[PDB]
């Protein structure tokens with residue numbers, strides 16, 4: 001993958017969450033996510049995909065991943081997907097927007113989904 | 125997984141896209157996605173996660189998955205994440221919202237992400 | 249406005265909410281919104297804008313509006329914006345996606361915004 | 373309005389766009405928007421609403437507004453709604469997420485809406 005080395009490693013967002021990911025040559029993303037906020041403790045499994053043959057015109061590398069918020073400690077009956085792009089360089093970044101859906105009854109489904117945006121850096 | 129059997133199988137959305145998924149006992153989602161629209165042809169790898177121990181109060185089961193839009197035929201330099209919940213019953217549904225991020229230059233990053241909503245059913 | 253007559257009137261969404269709007273020749277939208285769900289009762293002021301000279305190629309008419317959820321009865325310290333398009337015809341529709349932001353502390357701002365989608369029809 | 377004075381004035385986002393707004397005592401927002409990017413030139417009418425009696429616990433003030441991208445110079449057949457909160461203090465901010473819907477045919481409606489996030493400050 002073009003940015004396999006760039007993406008693999010430990011990333012941190014503006015909330016202090018820790019995103020540990022391995023990018024595979026086939027376009028796979030695997031790793032763990034630890035949220036500094038919310039109904040969460042310790043690490044959760046994540047899995048996703050990235051464009052392993054991105055454009056060479058300076059564009060970023062599109063990618064996404066999911067965490068379901070169940071582990072051996074807690075279950076928040078919810079999942080978040082981050083959709084974004086990796087931007088290489090001296091200050092590499094993964095810029096994302098995300099959707100956090102909670103399991104609800106049908107009557108509460110209108111209020112089932114939060115939206116936000118996280119920026120991940122290699123430092124902090 | 126509580127809804128492992130309910131989720132596993134072939135699903136179709138309102139656009140005619142085909143979502144083929146296997147839910148693992150560990151919370152994994154694997155399979156393929158074929159979009160009826162956009163810069164896409166044939167099947168693409170997907171991976172995601174679901175809550176394998178959902179609440180028993182009638183709430184849905186939270187889940188998400190990602191497709192990076194590269195396969196052996198095309199590369200649209202983009203990825204979509206769907207975030208949603210599975211609702212069991214006679215007319216089972218996966219109700220989602222999604223984020224499609226395209227790789228862009230930094231100057232175009234403000235217009236990098238589409239948002240929408242797909243409903244998947246076992247029929248059609 | 250091309251769709252001034254089409255847009256003006258009373259609309260209803262899938263939740264049973266009532267959207268009463270007047271489209272002005274200048275592109276203004278004014279009216280009231282009554283939500284069937286949430287921390288809301290009775291009517292709330294809304295204001296927005298629409299494209300008063302849409303394309304003539306069959307495309308919909310882009311529009312948006314805001315409700316702040318304060319009236320003489322309640323204040324939910326939140327606002328929703330709907331962004332969408334009006335589609336004319338025998339079964340006219342306003343198809344929207346929306347963002348509901350609640351006032352939060354800075355520590356809770358990551359969970360300040362819900363996202364959803366409402367479809368409005370002239371009937372129901 | 374509690375933050376009538378705080379909100380009224382000229383704001384700038386991270387793209388260099390200019391948001392000129394007057395907050396009314398009744399909860400109204402009026403003004404003009406000039407986008408530094410996209411199919412836009414000069415000023416466009418905006419209108420919205422804000423919570424004129426926010427909580428006093430340190431929470432932000434919820435607000436939203438709409439721009440339809442038609443003026444005397446251009447018509448981009450689209451509208452954006454920003455939904456967010458005003459945060460007062462020495463470095464006052466309006467933190468938003470937004471939805472930009474373009475008029476499309478029904479066949480293209482799945483790709484009608486962009487999502488993003490803008491932060492507005494009194495400086496820059």
Ligand SMILES: O=C(CCCC[C@@H]1SC[C@@H]2NC(=O)N[C@@H]21)NCCCN(CCc1ccccn1)CCc1ccccn1
Pocket residue numbers: 013015017034035036037038039040069076078080098100102103104111112113116118358359
């Ligand atoms: O927090 C969680 C799990 C952790 C989520 C962390 C987020 S991921 C995006 C962001 N980037 C990041 O690094 N960290 C955060 N999931 C919601 C848990 C539902 N709550 C009750 C059910 C409900 C249904 C509908 C609407 C509201 N609630 C439980 C308490 C809670 C916690 C957090 C937010 C809201 N409610």
Ligand SMILES: O=C(CCCC[C@@H]1SC[C@@H]2NC(=O)N[C@@H]21)NCCCN(CCc1ccccn1)CCc1ccccn1
Pocket residue numbers: 137139141158159160161162163164193200202204222224226227228235236237240242482483
């Ligand atoms: O289509 C794709 C891949 C297929 C996406 C299918 C979507 S998933 C959500 C939904 N549910 C579903 O079942 N099917 C659809 N990815 C965009 C491809 C970018 N275009 C140029 C780059 C660009 C950058 C910024 C803004 C706009 N464009 C290429 C042509 C194209 C195709 C579709 C939409 C827009 N542009």
Ligand SMILES: O=C(CCCC[C@@H]1SC[C@@H]2NC(=O)N[C@@H]21)NCCCN(CCc1ccccn1)CCc1ccccn1
Pocket residue numbers: 110111261263265282283284285286287288317324326328346348350351352359360361364366
């Ligand atoms: O309901 C409201 C006002 C009514 C909103 C109705 C929505 S508009 C989109 C949709 N289409 C429609 O026709 N009707 C609905 N506003 C949230 C009120 C905040 N709650 C505590 C604060 C908070 C902060 C952060 C995260 C969660 N909460 C009060 C109780 C409540 C009510 C509804 C949902 C959630 N919480």
Ligand SMILES: O=C(CCCC[C@@H]1SC[C@@H]2NC(=O)N[C@@H]21)NCCCN(CCc1ccccn1)CCc1ccccn1
Pocket residue numbers: 234235385387389406407408409410411412441448450452470472474475476483484485488490
């Ligand atoms: O730009 C505009 C008007 C200006 C929008 C500026 C945005 S507001 C959010 C953000 N904060 C800000 O300060 N500034 C930006 N509106 C789209 C115009 C549609 N294009 C073809 C139709 C189409 C339909 C579906 C999908 C894609 N396109 C015309 C060319 C264009 C311009 C910009 C982005 C994309 N396409």
Ligand SMILES: [Cu+2]
Pocket residue numbers: 054055199
């Ligand atoms: Cu290419």
Ligand SMILES: [Cu+2]
Pocket residue numbers: none
């Ligand atoms: Cu909650």
Ligand SMILES: [Cu+2]
Pocket residue numbers: 075178179
């Ligand atoms: Cu439980």
Ligand SMILES: [Cu+2]
Pocket residue numbers: none
């Ligand atoms: Cu495109």
Ligand SMILES: [Cu+2]
Pocket residue numbers: 302303447
């Ligand atoms: Cu035109």
Ligand SMILES: [Cu+2]
Pocket residue numbers: none
């Ligand atoms: Cu609430």
Ligand SMILES: [Cu+2]
Pocket residue numbers: 323426427
């Ligand atoms: Cu109060």
Ligand SMILES: [Cu+2]
Pocket residue numbers: none
């Ligand atoms: Cu365009």
